[PDB]
Amino acid sequence: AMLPISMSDEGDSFLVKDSLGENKIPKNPSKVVILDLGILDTFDALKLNDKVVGVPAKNLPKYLQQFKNKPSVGGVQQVDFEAINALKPDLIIISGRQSKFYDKLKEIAPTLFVGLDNANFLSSFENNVLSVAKLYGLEKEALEKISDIKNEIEKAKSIVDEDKKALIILTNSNKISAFGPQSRFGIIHDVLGINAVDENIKVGTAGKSINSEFILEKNPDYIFVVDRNVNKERAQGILDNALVAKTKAAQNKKIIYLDPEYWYLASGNGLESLKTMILEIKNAVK
């Protein structure tokens, strides 16, 4: 299990420990640079927009356009360190995609990691939300919102068919990769309890390289597609063949194209963006 964030209250600051290291973080930080999209959504949800001074305003998705005029500190993959320094922030918040930049960010300002543990997604989301809330004294508000998401999960689980199985795939122009439980797409299996056609896909970010023959072999009842092409080529075209057509998922129009701006960008730290993803699965399978 990923080490959670722990915090001790030291008057006008917190001593904070997470999996990447220790930071003294001021109470009520007023100049926050956020590189994790999900936790930026959580700042919205907690009414903290005015604390934010920098975002990755290159890739910003549709649901985060209230931040489109904030100073940009980069994109989905690149970080602009000159920019972050010029903002003179009091806190930087990052998740897994940015752990590679930890030491250089921490030379600028305290750097808080809000990682999502693929083996323990809900506990890490809750810990990430509540920890940001504690910086601002908003535990009450955050616990209410976390309750709302737990309720949503229970409504979603309650309609899942125990006998049906799903496959998760990531598509490229000319390649399909499969993902399973405890992957970065895993909440479909792990949180919502939809069974997988293959619970033994090996752990790792590249997933398992597959073909349409594999898909027909597994004969999923649902196929969840995350289309990285979102190129001319789309997942609909990769899957437009007589092997896939034969599957229960094809025949029942349960090939589901999930919005990559949520799944691929892994916005699970968002109080609203997680909800959106929960409902997107629910609605696909009810």
Numbering used by the authors: 22 to 251, 255 to 310
What does the primary publication say about this deposited structure?
The periplasmic binding protein (PBP) CeuE1 is an important component of the Fe(III) uptake system in Campylobacter jejuni, a commensal Gram-negative bacterium in the avian gut, but a common source of food poisoning in humans. CeuE, an integral part of the CeuBCDE ABC transporter of C. jejuni, is responsible for capturing Fe(III)-siderophore complexes in the periplasm for delivery to their respective inner membrane transporter. C. jejuni does not itself synthesize siderophores, but capitalizes on their secretion by other bacteria, such as E. coli. Here we report a combined solution and structural study of a series of synthetic tetradentate analogues of the enterobactin-derived bis(2, 3-dihydroxybenzoyl-L-Ser), to explore the ligand-binding promiscuity of CeuE, both wild type and with mutations of the Fe(III) binding residues H227 and Y288.
In contrast, the effect of mutating the histidine was less pronounced. The resulting Kd values show trends similar to that observed for wild type, but with systematically weaker binding.
